[PDB]
Design brief:
Belongs to the GFP family. By secondary structure, this protein is mostly beta strands. It contains two helices and eleven strands. The chain has helices at residues 4-7, 81-84; strands at 13-23, 26-37, 42-49, 90-98, 103-113, 116-126, 146-153, 158-168, 174-185, 197-206, 215-225. The longest helix is centred in the N-terminal third of the chain and has 4 residues, at 4-7.
Length: 227
């Protein structure tokens, strides 16, 4: 079989991201657009903070701001939950614990609206230190590689994932962000529940020389592995 879900991802797909956040009562909104090419694990997006200055570092929002665009090798296609649930989509939830600082909780719905794959996110951050690495913007504007470890959750008709992002601090240290994730389908239909595997993820952060708003240009490649 080649599912409806997979076929949606065969060429270039327009992407729209909308995020509403509140971190320590600092309210903010982010929009992004661009496109995905899952054949190549490829994402190209630009994000704008629509409310002025982003109160947190951009690198901290990367994981929150469409794993359905992962390149799953042919031999691992029966393990691709994300695409399996499309076009109806999935709920993605996380808790991100910044070591020695606060945490984000996120809830997102990822789904097709017509031809556009949409990521709608609510983010809530508490317990942050006002002149910590996050609210004091002490994180370097780059990103590291890491692997995202994916396991089935039979008891929820979904998946769980775990991973550590390590953000460089401007003094040369590292700020650990320990991610705990769950995804459930939005619809009632069948889903692939995968064997354990990982997503090998990389991103490059850059700026648009003409853009006056606070923003982030992102180029990202993700390939599934470990089977």
């Amino acid at each position: 079989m080649v599912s409806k879900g997979e076929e949606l991802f065969g060429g270039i797909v327009p992407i729209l991201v909308e995020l509403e956040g509140d971190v320590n009562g600092h309210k903010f909104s982010v929009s992004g657009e661009g496109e995905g090419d899952a054949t190549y694990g490829k994402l190209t997006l630009k994000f704008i903070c629509t409310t002025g200055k982003l109160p947190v570092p951009w690198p901290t929002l990367v994981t929150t701001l469409v794993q359905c665009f992962s390149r799953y090798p042919d031999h691992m296609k029966q393990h691709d939950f994300f695409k399996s649930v499309m076009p109806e989509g999935y709920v993605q939830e996380r808790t991100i614990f910044f070591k020695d600082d606060g945490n984000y909780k996120t809830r997102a719905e990822v789904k097709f609206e017509g031809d556009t794959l949409v990521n709608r996110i609510e983010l809530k951050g508490i317990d942050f230190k006002e002149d910590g690495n996050i609210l004091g913007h002490k994180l370097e504007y780059n990103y590291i590689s890491h692997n995202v470890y994916i396991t089935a959750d039979k008891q929820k008709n979904g998946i769980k994932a775990n991973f550590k992002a390590r953000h460089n601090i401007t003094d040369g240290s590292v700020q650990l962000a320990d991610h705990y994730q769950q995804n459930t389908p939005i619809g009632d239909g069948p889903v692939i529940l995968p064997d354990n595997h990982y997503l090998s993820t990389q991103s490059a952060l850059s700026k648009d020389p003409n853009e006056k708003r606070d923003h982030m240009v992102l180029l990202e490649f993700v390939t599934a592995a470990g089977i």
